[PDB]
Paper text:
Recent reports have shown PRL phosphatases bind tightly to the CNNM family of membrane proteins to regulate magnesium efflux. We report four new crystal structures of PRL proteins bound to the CNNM3 CBS-pair domain that reveal the effects of cysteine disulphide formation and nucleotide binding on complex formation.
We also crystallized the PRL2•CNNM3 complex in the presence of a mixture of AMP and ATP. Electron density was observed at the CBS-pair domain dimer interface but it was intermediate in size and could not be fit satisfactorily by either AMP or ATP. Accordingly, the density was modeled as ADP. While it is possible that ADP was formed by hydrolysis of ATP during crystallization (see below), more likely, the crystals contain a mixture of AMP- and ATP-bound protein. The nucleotide ribose hydrogen bonded with Thr319 and Asp439 while the phosphates associated with Thr347 and Thr436. His346 mediated π-stacking interactions with the adenine moiety. A putative metal ion was identified on the dimer axis coordinated by Glu438 and the nucleotide phosphates. This site of nucleotide binding is conserved in other CBS-pair domains including the domain from CNNM29, 10. Other than minor rearrangements, nucleotide binding did not significantly change the conformation of the CBS-pair domain or its interaction with PRL2. Superposition of the free and ADP-bound CBS-pair domains showed a shift of 0.6 Å over 144 atoms.
Residue numbers in the entry:
A (entry chain C), B (entry chain C): 297 to 446
C (entry chain A), D (entry chain A): -1 to 155
Amino acid sequence: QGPLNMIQGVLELRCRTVEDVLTPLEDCFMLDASTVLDFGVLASIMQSGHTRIPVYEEERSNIVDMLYLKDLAFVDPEDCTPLSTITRFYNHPLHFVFNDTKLDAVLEEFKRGKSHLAIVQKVNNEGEGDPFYEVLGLVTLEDVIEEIIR
Amino acid sequence: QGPLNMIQGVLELRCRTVEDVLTPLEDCFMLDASTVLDFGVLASIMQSGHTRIPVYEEERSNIVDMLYLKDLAFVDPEDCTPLSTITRFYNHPLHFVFNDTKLDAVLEEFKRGKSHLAIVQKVNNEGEGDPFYEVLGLVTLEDVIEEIIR
Amino acid sequence: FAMNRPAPVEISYENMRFLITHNPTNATLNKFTEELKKYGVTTLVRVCDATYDKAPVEKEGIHVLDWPFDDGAPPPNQIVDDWLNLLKTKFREEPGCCVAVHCVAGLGRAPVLVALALIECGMKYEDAVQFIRQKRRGAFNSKQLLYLEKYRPKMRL
Amino acid sequence: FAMNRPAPVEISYENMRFLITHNPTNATLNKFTEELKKYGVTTLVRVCDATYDKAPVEKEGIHVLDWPFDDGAPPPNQIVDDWLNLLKTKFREEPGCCVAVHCVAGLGRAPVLVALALIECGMKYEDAVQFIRQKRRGAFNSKQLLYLEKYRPKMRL
Ligand SMILES: Nc1ncnc2c1ncn2[C@@H]1O[C@H](COP(=O)(O)OP(=O)(O)O)[C@@H](O)[C@H]1O
Ligand SMILES: Nc1ncnc2c1ncn2[C@@H]1O[C@H](COP(=O)(O)OP(=O)(O)O)[C@@H](O)[C@H]1O
């Protein structure tokens, strides 16, 4: 039990990597760049219970900007304002972490820095072609916590 | 430093109480029950970066319902739909924790239960009058975490 | 444990049964009576002033009794005599019915009357407070605890 | 450390200077050139096909060069000869200028050309890769590493 289980949790932060803890792409709430912000998609956003939402064109693995909740502030549903207008009102920074990365580093950087959200890359060796970074999904601060508290 | 500092954090969960960790009322984002949901207050909600927002009448210490982000789903700004209509579309449960309560209990209950949010009471002995529970503010899961990770 | 709700409380003892309750508005008056029917109360004693209409509650057949007394005081001797006489007649009418008491603070003078009932039904003053405070923390002030100590059964239930 | 940005990369060596870059659209074309002016590039080599108009970039006075070759391949011998000859003339024109290379994957064939330049400027093949991969992780595939090993300086910068 318990606090003893948690202490092993913090001890295993140096062992465990982002790979272990992430939300993989297929379970991420994200929007297409070309999406319009009508009543329903706005409802869908506010249902999703997420404050930072990734934005892609047109394959899901191609993350391009972030939408924040605060970005939605004075938008009228069926203005029908398209998404990429609002993403173009702001530089929100998008942060990328490697899938290698040990959790204790990740936790300290989250302790430091701007966003609670990074998105996750591995390198890609097989293929004839050029090496590319391959998008795996999201990791947040709350992800790293859940290692400790379970 | 570091993970060693965190391990003391989990060890002190049995010591430390909600009193130590809470957000006191004066720093809580909350709405009056009689508030109308026009463009600006809706903007103010979506700026605040909170998903669960307490609702009071008409002194701030008198919490009555919770507003969720999901509750806002198909509302039109200047319908001008008043708040207490939307709070009356839903039973959202509101949970109360005592200011006495040690953090390790609180953490386990958050690990269990429905909301990530409790609101905080102490009993009240001084006064000539009846004893009452006095509202101090909010405690969340993220509050309890911050004890460990700092 | 350790987290709770804006919510009624029950105290049972022999075939006496009691409910301590929140205040409603008219706004949730019709829901409030449905709570009370669910506990099978025949009787409400308002011991603190409220503004709602009682007559929706009385229409659905609960005896409603307006017995207000001073904030954080002991009950005056009339009120205790009334209250005891009420309990006789209403547990005479139906054994294993419930009697609701409610204030606008559920700690204080509402549970005093319940503790008055429990003392004149058996249990020790020391014991009687404990059963209350287990159910609603921090339950009386010191004046009430004084009165509850200095109180003597006949023993007239 | 350990977190990063969709963002240009710089490699410096003697008075050679190189930029490896993301793709733009036309959508952020005007912002993209302003990055490049900020690093003081005179020269862009597109080594992978892109659709944007180059002529906004060329209007603001950067020499733009369309030298595409196969995905994940070594550069053909023309392209290396061209590329080396370009570097001579353009560091002749201004010492301590930058030359941009960009692809649509910044790992792969864009940094090959930079590693080709570094090898024919000094540093060991073993050393040359290391400076690249420190800056952009996992930088070449095995065919490119083969070619970078089997490569011989004259030493013609
Ligand atoms: N846009 C998103 N789409 C899908 N899952 C997300 C998104 N944002 C966060 N999550 C996931 O939700 C969990 C908790 O996230 P949290 O830090 O509370 O941010 P949020 O307030 O956006 O939920 C994590 O497991 C994380 O991977
Ligand atoms: N409605 C609110 N008003 C003010 N502060 C809040 C509110 N909700 C949460 N907080 C505070 O924000 C911090 C983190 O809350 P968190 O668990 O992330 O929920 P949220 O997603 O609502 O921010 C905590 O310190 C908590 O006390």
